[PDB]
C-alpha cells in the first residue's frame, strides 16, 4: 500500500552537489509532514531535514549548515533533497520518512538511497578462485572461496553456482584496503562432489557494469 521509494544517490566528489528524490504512493502525500534521515557508515542516524505537509515549514539538522534544501511537489507525490558542497561526513544512506502525528514518530521509511562522497573512482573488482592447493582438506566436506579485490564503490553481489549453492555460503563484509574494497566468500560442499561437480562463484559489480564467473579448479601443482 504505502510506498516510499528514494532515488538519486551515487558517487559524488567532495564539493559536489546531488539531488535525492523520494516517490510516494498509497497515501494522500500532501496531508503529511515528511523527513530525510541519514544513516552514516558508523550506523549513526541523523535527522537531516523536515518539511511540513504544505511546504511552508522546514527544519534542518545541526550539521547541515545551509548546504541542504528540502522541497516537495505534492502534485507529483515526491519529496526532494538538494545537497551541495558535499563533504566526506555527508556519506550516508539517505531515507525518506513519513510523520504520523505532531510528536513526529516516523511511521513509514523508504528503502534508502546511498550517497558516497569521495575522490575514489569506480573500479571493477578483481576476482580470484580460492582452491585449497598446498592446504588440501581431507574430510567429508571441502571449503572453497572467491577473493573479490580492488573494487569501488560498494556493493558487489556474490553467488555460487548461480545461486544453486545457497546453503553453506558465507560472504564476508567488505573492507577498505588501499582505499578500495575487498571481500571473500566461502562455500562448503561435500568433498565427493568437487571437482567432479563444478563450483563457480558469480560476482556482480553493478556500478562498473561487470559480471565475472570464476570456476574453482584444483590447482595445477
Amino acid at each position: 500500500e504505502v510506498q516510499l521509494v528514494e532515488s538519486g544517490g551515487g558517487l559524488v566528489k567532495p564539493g559536489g552537489s546531488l539531488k535525492l528524490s523520494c516517490a510516494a504512493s498509497g497515501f494522500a502525500f500532501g496531508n503529511y509532514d515528511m523527513s530525510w534521515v541519514r544513516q552514516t557508515p558508523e550506523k549513526r542516524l541523523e535527522w537531516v531535514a523536515f518539511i511540513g505537509s504544505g511546504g511552508g515549514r522546514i527544519y534542518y539538522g545541526d550539521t547541515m549548515k545551509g548546504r541542504f534544501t528540502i522541497s516537495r511537489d505534492n502534485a507529483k507525490n515526491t519529496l526532494y533533497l538538494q545537497m551541495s558542497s558535499l563533504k566526506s561526513e555527508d556519506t550516508a544512506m539517505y531515507y525518506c520518512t513519513r510523520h504520523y502525528n505532531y510528536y513526529y514518530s516516523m511511521d513509514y521509511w523508504g528503502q534508502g538511497t546511498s550517497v558516497i562522497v569521495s575522490s575514489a573512482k569506480t573500479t571493477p573488482p578483481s576476482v580470484y578462485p580460492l582452491a585449497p592447493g598446498s592446504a588440501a582438506q581431507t574430510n567429508s566436506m571441502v571449503t572453497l572461496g572467491c577473493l573479490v579485490k580492488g573494487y569501488f564503490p560498494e556493493p558487489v553481489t556474490v553467488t555460487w553456482n548461480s545461486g544453486s549453492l545457497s546453503s553453506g555460503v558465507h560472504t564476508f563484509p567488505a573492507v577498505l584496503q588501499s582505499d578500495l574494497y575487498t571481500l571473500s566468500s566461502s562455500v562448503t560442499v561435500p568433498s565427493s562432489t568437487w571437482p567432479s561437480e563444478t563450483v563457480t562463484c558469480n560476482v556482480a559489480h553493478p556500478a562498473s557494469s561487470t559480471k565475472v564467473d570464476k570456476k574453482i579448479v584444483p590447482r595445477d601443482c
Binding site: 541523523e46 580460492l130 571449503t143
Partner: protein, 211 residues
C-alpha cells in the same frame, strides 16, 4: 543541545529471557520513539509516544520512561527480536546510538580453512592468504598468523559476518595481504584460531614450495 545515549551498546540473551535496554536524555523530554533495524533494511517504527506499539509489534514489547530516562523491554525474548533498537524524540538531531540485541546459543568451535594466494593473483603481483573461521560461537575469537615460526601482525584484516539468521553462529575471514615478493621470501604460513571452546588452538597451514 539535547542528546540521547543508549545502554548497553550490545547485549545477547537466550530466547526466553527478559530484555531491557535504556535510552537516556541529557535533559528532560517526553514522547520517546524506538526504531528497529535489521541488517540490509530500513529502520522500522517499533514503539512510539513512549509506550504505544507500532502495528505488527508483539505485546511482549513495552516502552516506558519519563524525563531523562526511557527504556524498551521485551518479555520472553524470541529469535526474531534480534535487531538494533534506536531511540529518538522530536527535539533530537542525532538518534541514540542503538542497542544491538544478539541471540545467545551454545558455544561452537570454528571450522578453519586456509588458502594460499591464487596463481592468478600472484600474476598481478599481489598475495592474499585467506583464512576462514566459519560457524563459531561466541563472536570473540582470536586469530594468529605465523610465518616461518614467527608471529606476524602487519597486513592482517579480519571481517565478521552478522550473526547468522538460521543458526546464530558467527563466521569471520582473516586475510593476510602481502606483496608477491614478500610472500615468496617465506614458506610456512599458519592461521591459528583461539576460541573459548578449547584451550588448544585450531591450526591450518601450508608450505608455499608445495604445489
Amino acid at each position: 543541545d539535547i542528546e540521547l545515549t543508549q545502554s548497553p551498546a550490545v547485549m545477547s540473551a537466550f530466547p526466553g529471557e527478559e530484555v531491557t535496554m535504556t535510552c537516556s536524555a541529557s535533559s528532560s523530554i517526553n514522547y520517546m520513539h524506538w526504531y528497529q533495524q535489521k541488517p540490509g533494511t530500513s529502520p522500522k517504527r517499533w514503539i512510539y509516544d513512549t509506550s504505544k506499539l507500532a502495528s505488527g509489534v508483539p505485546a511482549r514489547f513495552s516502552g516506558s520512561g519519563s524525563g531523562t530516562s526511557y527504556s524498551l523491554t521485551i518479555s520472553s525474548m524470541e529469535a526474531e527480536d534480534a535487531a538494533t533498537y534506536y531511540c529518538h524524540q522530536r527535539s533530537i538531531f542525532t538518534f541514540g546510538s542503538g542497542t544491538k540485541l544478539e541471540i545467545k546459543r551454545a558455544d561452537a568451535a570454528p571450522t578453519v580453512s586456509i588458502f594460499p594466494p591464487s596463481s592468478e593473483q600472484l600474476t598481478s603481483g599481489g598475495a592474499s592468504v585467506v583464512c576462514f573461521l566459519n560457524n563459531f560461537y561466541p563472536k570473540d575469537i582470536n586469530v594468529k598468523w605465523k610465518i616461518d615460526g614467527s608471529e606476524r601482525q602487519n597486513g592482517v584484516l579480519n571481517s565478521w559476518t552478522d550473526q547468522d539468521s538460521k543458526d546464530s553462529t558467527y563466521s569471520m575471514s582473516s586475510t593476510l595481504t602481502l606483496t608477491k615478493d614478500e610472500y615468496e621470501r617465506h614458506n610456512s604460513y599458519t592461521c591459528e584460531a583461539t576460541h573459548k571452546t578449547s584451550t588448544s588452538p585450531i591450526v591450518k597451514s601450508f608450505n608455499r614450495n608445495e604445489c
